[PDB]
Design an enzyme around this catalytic site. Structure first.
Site, PDB file in Angstrom:
ATOM      1  N   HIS A   1      28.393  20.593  63.049  1.00 39.73           N
ATOM      2  CA  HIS A   1      27.991  20.093  64.402  1.00 39.73           C
ATOM      3  C   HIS A   1      29.204  19.671  65.212  1.00 39.73           C
ATOM      4  CE1 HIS A   1      23.407  18.921  64.371  1.00 39.73           C
ATOM      5  NE2 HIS A   1      23.614  20.073  63.759  1.00 39.73           N
TER       6      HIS A   1
ATOM      7  N   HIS B   1      21.665  26.474  55.394  1.00 39.21           N
ATOM      8  CA  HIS B   1      20.367  26.054  54.851  1.00 39.21           C
ATOM      9  C   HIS B   1      20.137  26.348  53.380  1.00 39.21           C
ATOM     10  CE1 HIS B   1      19.405  26.328  59.350  1.00 39.21           C
ATOM     11  NE2 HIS B   1      20.053  25.177  59.081  1.00 39.21           N
TER      12      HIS B   1
HETATM   13  C1  HEM Z   1      20.452  28.641  64.453  1.00 36.97           C
HETATM   14  C2  HEM Z   1      21.214  27.632  64.036  1.00 36.97           C
HETATM   15  C3  HEM Z   1      20.695  26.458  63.188  1.00 36.97           C
HETATM   16  C4  HEM Z   1      19.620  25.681  63.375  1.00 36.97           C
HETATM   17  C5  HEM Z   1      18.559  25.745  64.511  1.00 36.97           C
HETATM   18  C6  HEM Z   1      19.600  24.711  62.287  1.00 36.97           C
HETATM   19  C7  HEM Z   1      18.634  23.761  62.177  1.00 36.97           C
HETATM   20  C8  HEM Z   1      18.593  22.672  61.380  1.00 36.97           C
HETATM   21  C9  HEM Z   1      17.692  21.520  61.470  1.00 36.97           C
HETATM   22  C10 HEM Z   1      16.585  21.313  62.504  1.00 36.97           C
HETATM   23  C11 HEM Z   1      17.996  20.640  60.555  1.00 36.97           C
HETATM   24  C12 HEM Z   1      17.261  19.339  60.301  1.00 36.97           C
HETATM   25  C13 HEM Z   1      18.154  18.135  60.444  1.00 36.97           C
HETATM   26  C14 HEM Z   1      17.377  17.038  59.840  1.00 36.97           C
HETATM   27  O1  HEM Z   1      16.181  16.834  60.225  1.00 36.97           O
HETATM   28  O2  HEM Z   1      17.938  16.339  58.978  1.00 36.97           O
HETATM   29  C15 HEM Z   1      19.094  21.223  59.833  1.00 36.97           C
HETATM   30  C16 HEM Z   1      19.717  20.715  58.746  1.00 36.97           C
HETATM   31  C17 HEM Z   1      20.808  21.287  58.152  1.00 36.97           C
HETATM   32  N1  HEM Z   1      21.561  22.307  58.662  1.00 36.97           N
HETATM   33 FE1  HEM Z   1      21.126  23.602  60.093  1.00 36.97          FE
HETATM   34  N2  HEM Z   1      20.693  24.934  61.415  1.00 36.97           N
HETATM   35  C18 HEM Z   1      21.372  25.993  61.986  1.00 36.97           C
HETATM   36  C19 HEM Z   1      22.518  26.576  61.476  1.00 36.97           C
HETATM   37  C20 HEM Z   1      23.237  25.959  60.517  1.00 36.97           C
HETATM   38  C21 HEM Z   1      24.546  26.310  60.113  1.00 36.97           C
HETATM   39  C22 HEM Z   1      25.269  27.454  60.817  1.00 36.97           C
HETATM   40  C23 HEM Z   1      24.876  25.469  59.132  1.00 36.97           C
HETATM   41  C24 HEM Z   1      26.221  25.416  58.355  1.00 36.97           C
HETATM   42  C25 HEM Z   1      26.933  26.543  58.361  1.00 36.97           C
HETATM   43  C26 HEM Z   1      23.745  24.536  58.928  1.00 36.97           C
HETATM   44  C27 HEM Z   1      23.636  23.536  58.027  1.00 36.97           C
HETATM   45  C28 HEM Z   1      22.662  22.584  57.800  1.00 36.97           C
HETATM   46  C29 HEM Z   1      22.552  21.728  56.628  1.00 36.97           C
HETATM   47  C30 HEM Z   1      23.387  21.635  55.370  1.00 36.97           C
HETATM   48  C31 HEM Z   1      21.291  20.902  56.876  1.00 36.97           C
HETATM   49  C32 HEM Z   1      20.653  19.806  56.012  1.00 36.97           C
HETATM   50  C33 HEM Z   1      21.599  18.634  55.919  1.00 36.97           C
HETATM   51  C34 HEM Z   1      20.936  17.728  54.947  1.00 36.97           C
HETATM   52  O3  HEM Z   1      20.155  18.269  54.114  1.00 36.97           O
HETATM   53  O4  HEM Z   1      21.200  16.511  55.042  1.00 36.97           O
HETATM   54  N3  HEM Z   1      22.789  24.903  59.777  1.00 36.97           N
HETATM   55  N4  HEM Z   1      19.411  22.431  60.367  1.00 36.97           N
END
Ligand code: HEM
Ligand code: HEM
Lengths: 660, 663
Positions: free
Chosen positions: B66, B206
């Site tokens: 981010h 994800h």
């Molecule tokens: C189209 C682009 C993306 C969208 C819309 C997206 C969406 C989301 C959303 C909505 C969450 C929920 C946050 C929460 O409620 O805690 C999330 C968590 C997360 N996202 Fe994304 N993501 C995207 C791309 C990426 C990319 C490119 C990465 C890293 C390269 C990433 C890594 C993560 C990780 C690791 C989590 C979970 C963090 C945790 O489990 O504490 N995402 N994402």
């Protein structure tokens, strides 16, 4: 509700293309600028035709409005940095067409360049305008350093009041009260008021040739690019017409028409109310400002009438009319104050037209009838101030109360003069009178003993000794943490008496908030951190400096009533970065204190026990984003020496704010 | 609509209590000892924000992603090179919810090592370390990101307000995967990411963690950090974050094929979650309770997918990609290893700016690498020699100045890209930009390449074309100054080399193509912005104050190096002669301006008496006489005793700009 940190930001550089003005100005052949000014006055430019073929009356308005916006509360506003030139003041509707006024002075400004500031120029045009209309000013001095932008601190569209009558009502009884209070908060008193209002309107006319809300384009800031900075595309106020019959000569004129004939509430040729005579013997008394085969009837304003209707103002005027030497004397004197009030003390009045007489409002300082102290005496004095029954806390806190009054807007205040021992400083809540007396006492006796002991005519002032113990104290605390710092020190301050002090005027320096001392007054409507930053600006501090300052102070512990708020250390009077280490520590969690106006409690997150007390001042360094970023640098394992040095350079700087 | 000069003011001083070099201090870091500490941090759950799965990694990854996701190609601002996630409004974007906690968690590491690692460098390392301690190797790492101390006042934040990329629920809040698919592609394009790199990044992110949405965030969460009471010390949104609940994979803290097997092998159904948001759930009860609960023994949750996930499955193009991935693990790893690395370093500029032991030996094309100078460098003797040679040629002063601006003007301090060291000016797309007037430029590049050839041919010493563009202009200006009777010797740093096409990703330099260059008074017929505003925006990218901008434009018009050599703003009858003539003139009230009927960008300056057009101009020129702050600046320079000043200031800006990219 985010901290307007930008104002502090301003103090880290100076915008504009300049890498001292006092020196440059000292090279200016003043007499020649006054010459070219004389000239300019009857030298009509087609793009803005001169009234009666004399620009003076206008230029007076340009000077008067340039200074009229001063305020004693913060010493801001005024004409010190020539900030009439910049938005939003430059587009105040009360400043209509005054773009043209400033434009006429561009050739001149251009001719002299760095030798005269817009600032000093505008007030000089004011002077010259007058001088060459039958009068003669009480003096003039330069020294106004030109600013390159607005004052981002000011919480401000009129100089004083509405000329139609408060809320647009031709009720002169009522407008007075508005006049009476503006002028008060301006520093002028009843007599100074009528002098300036009357001295002022003895010249020129008003401009309401047609209604403005329909005949006048955008004000400078919204005007189209092609207007090169001018605006309101003859109309200014909406009210039409002259006061005197001789609108371009100094004389009774105004006070005459005002006091001799009677006046009726009429509607003008631009919609706004004005007044004319019921009397018919003034009809077409005045030459038309432009058409040479034309005559015009005088007008007055509610604002003018309110002089003639208020019990008190009326008598000031009768006096003036029954005696014109007094009319002049008062108006000569008021004008000079209105225009110079915000430049500080004599040391800063430059040029060969400064009176020889010094004004009470300059808060002047006597001379040193002795030889200044030397380093040998300095160490000597410094040993003996630490050997006293006085703690670090005590010296620091005094040394702060002496210097913390300096404000940079009007250059008033500071340690030099030692006005802390006098009224009304020795008796301020925040200064802790009974405590202050002690410290003063103790240091007086060092002077005493120091001087008596000299066989060479050297002496030391209290004003020096206050600061010197302060530096000493601060050095002690830094030695108590393992550092060896020598602060720079400047002997030469002097001790001012009551006789040369306008005590009631100093009330406007009373801090309703003091960060170094975690003092917060009951009243305050702003949030503490807001006033903190605002003051931080009078001392010319950047966010970073404000940050080290307060932070290092909390390690030393120098609070109002010696409380333990923000004193996040358990080795007080030792100079360290414990404030930040503990404020940053997540082991501790913060919450408001119940049944408590300013207090918060910092608990162990686990145990849930009390660990610290604090207020918004201390906590803000941990809440707002930018301040925190600074706190995080200072909290860091290796930031400690750096915070000491930064604390020192800061304190030492504030100590010297008024060594003009 | 007041021109916002505040952006230029920030370029005068630097806020913060840091004396004006981070690099010599990074070379002091024990990178392996910080990575050790980060390692341990991964599994030390604090009670204020207890780890999911008892391992913070995933939080950390999404924090780094981010920090870097906000990056814009168009103007190169945002990104993770200042660490600016730490300041408003960004840290209070709803999309950044609870990352207050993640950052907070790194505080003691930050405090322990201090000046030797920026928050910026640290937030990215925390992601590299989270990722490695979960069974994945990163392509490499580099430090060198200067920490900032306030927001970027230049950035205009506007696929939605304060969403890193897209609506995780779907476009306008509908669960339409196919529609989401397009919005993924677009935003990701304007990010310099393609279908593979996008797929890789979304799919390997994800692979870890979950989405927390235990209740509706609309009213179970407090205010964002900026609107939070003071007692919170900069935390905000008092487990809910995005309002969507569930993990993606069965081992959310291990790297595996879990996301792509789960997404690809099972049917998903849309539904409204516990937090009120759109998520998808699988039809088959095989995946039901296949996942331990974020905080438990005795319980299992069922995986979820987002709509933005289902999208890589429904759009046939991402689907082609996803399928390749599933089938070849290694392939989908690398794409992800390289997309991550590029994502979090893309804005650090060229290869010399990347510091530390874990910088990969390979340099990527998006770094804009520069070849090495495989030859000796020019000395005071040959400099002056060649200078005469340039001045000898039939090239005008408006030729040498204009070219050399063309060359250096493309540098933007936001992402370190562009500049005139590499003569990329001569390569594509640059030599074909309209504003550079290709045919005209080509003439100039003709002569200089022959001087180059003449000199090299005639002790193993050599001269880059890129050096000569600049050397030209520096003597150009030296002359315009000699024309006004000023002797000023511009300092010159030899050294710049000539980049080839194999060092230049041509389509990516389009992002540096000016809309409204002011040194040349160029202004496209597209711009919605009034021209002066873009002027100021571009200025900021060159790290200029209001003063240095003004000094430059003004001295420029006295030289007349305009696009298409027009006359616009050229208020002097002594062209190629460097003087305060721009302001003296511009400020004179004997002249009166008005718009030029039926022209877009053009203004007539008139004699107030005769009505005879005296000059023509654009808002570029006219702004230094309208705005209240710039007019104050032009007055100083138009003063009768301040020619010599402008001359030197204009030089001094000129010299600073030519050298900006000299890292
Ligand atoms: C189209 C682009 C993306 C969208 C819309 C997206 C969406 C989301 C959303 C909505 C969450 C929920 C946050 C929460 O409620 O805690 C999330 C968590 C997360 N996202 Fe994304 N993501 C995207 C791309 C990426 C990319 C490119 C990465 C890293 C390269 C990433 C890594 C993560 C990780 C690791 C989590 C979970 C963090 C945790 O489990 O504490 N995402 N994402
Ligand atoms: C309550 C205080 C005052 C009020 C309400 C007031 C009101 C006004 C107004 C509305 C104008 C009209 C400008 C125009 O339409 O052309 C004006 C003009 C003028 N004012 Fe004041 N004034 C005040 C005090 C002063 C002071 C203190 C001075 C200076 C000593 C001054 C000097 C002048 C002069 C010389 C003009 C005429 C300018 C010209 O001839 O073009 N006034 N006043």
């Amino acid at each position: 509700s985010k901290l307007n940190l930008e104002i502090l930001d301003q103090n880290a550089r100076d915008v504009g293309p300049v890498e001292d003005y006092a020196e440059e100005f000292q090279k200016l052949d003043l007499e020649a600028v006054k010459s070219d000014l004389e000239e300019l006055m009857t030298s009509s430019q087609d793009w803005w035709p001169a009234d009666y073929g004399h620009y003076g009356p206008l230029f007076i308005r340009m000077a008067w409005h340039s200074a009229g916006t001063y305020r004693t509360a913060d010493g801001r506003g005024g004409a010190a940095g020539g900030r009439q030139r910049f938005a939003p003041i430059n587009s105040w509707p009360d400043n209509a067409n005054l773009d043209k006024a400033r434009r006429l002075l561009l050739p001149i400004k251009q001719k002299y360049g760095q030798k005269i500031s817009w600032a000093d120029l505008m007030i000089l045009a004011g002077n010259v305008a007058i001088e060459s209309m039958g009068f003669k000013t009480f003096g003039y001095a330069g020294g106004r350093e030109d600013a390159f932008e607005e004052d981002k601190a000011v919480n401000w569209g009129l100089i004083y009041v509405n000329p139609e009558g408060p809320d647009g009502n031709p009720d002169p009884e009522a407008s007075a009260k508005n006049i009476r209070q503006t002028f008060d908060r301006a520093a002028m008193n009843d007599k100074e008021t009528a002098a300036l209002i009357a001295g002022g309107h003895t010249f020129g006319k008003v401009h309401g040739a047609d209604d403005p809300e329909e005949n006048l384009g955008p004000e400078p800031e919204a005007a189209p690019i092609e207007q090169q900075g001018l605006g309101w595309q003859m109309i200014t106020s909406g009210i039409e017409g002259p006061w005197t019959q001789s609108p371009t000569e100094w004389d009774m004129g105004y006070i005459n028409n005002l006091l001799d004939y009677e006046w009726e509430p009429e509607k003008g040729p631009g919609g706004a109310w004005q007044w004319a005579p019921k009397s018919e013997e003034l009809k077409n008394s005045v030459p038309d400002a432009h058409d040479p085969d034309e005559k015009q009837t005088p007008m007055m304003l509610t604002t003018d009438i309110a002089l003639k209707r208020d019990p008190d103002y009326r008598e000031v005027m009768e006096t003036f009319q029954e005696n014109p030497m007094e009319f002049g004397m008062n108006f000569a004197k008021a004008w000079y104050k209105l225009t110079h009030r915000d430049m500080g003390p004599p040391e800063r009045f430059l040029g060969p037209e400064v009176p020889d007489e010094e004004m009470i409002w300059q808060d002047p300082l006597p001379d040193a009838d002795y030889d200044l102290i030397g380093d040998e005496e300095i160490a000597e004095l410094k040993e003996e101030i630490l050997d006293s029954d006085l703690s670090v806390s005590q010296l620091v806190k005094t040394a702060w109360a002496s210097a913390s009054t300096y404000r940079d807007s009007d250059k008033r205040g500071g340690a030099n003069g030692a006005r802390l021992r006098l009224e009304p400083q020795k008796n301020w809540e925040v200064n802790e009178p009974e405590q202050l007396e002690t410290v003063l006492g103790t240091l007086e006796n060092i002077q005493t003993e120091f001087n008596d002991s000299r066989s060479d005519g050297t002496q030391v002032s209290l004003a020096d000794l206050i600061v010197l113990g302060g530096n000493a104290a601060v050095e002690q605390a830094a030695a108590n943490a393992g550092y060896d710092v020598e602060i720079p020190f400047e002997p030469g301050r002097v001790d001012a008496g009551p006789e040369h002090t306008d005590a009631p005027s100093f009330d406007a320096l009373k801090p309703k908030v003091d960060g170094v001392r975690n003092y917060i007054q009951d009243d305050i409507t702003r949030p503490a951190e807001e006033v903190l930053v605002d003051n931080a600006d009078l001392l010319n501090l950047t966010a970073s400096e404000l940050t080290a300052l307060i932070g290092g102070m909390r390690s030393i512990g120098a609070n109002y009533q010696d409380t333990d708020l923000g004193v996040f250390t358990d080795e007080p009077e030792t100079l360290t970065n414990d404030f930040f280490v503990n404020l940053l520590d997540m082991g501790t969690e913060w919450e408001p204190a119940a049944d408590s106006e300013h207090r918060y409690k910092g608990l162990d997150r686990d145990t849930g026990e009390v660990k610290w007390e604090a207020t918004r001042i201390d906590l803000i360094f941990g809440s707002n984003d930018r301040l925190r970023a600074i706190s995080e640098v200072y909290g860091s394992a290796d930031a400690e020496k750096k915070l000491v040095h930064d604390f020192v350079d800061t304190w030492s700087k504030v100590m010297k704010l008024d060594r003009f």
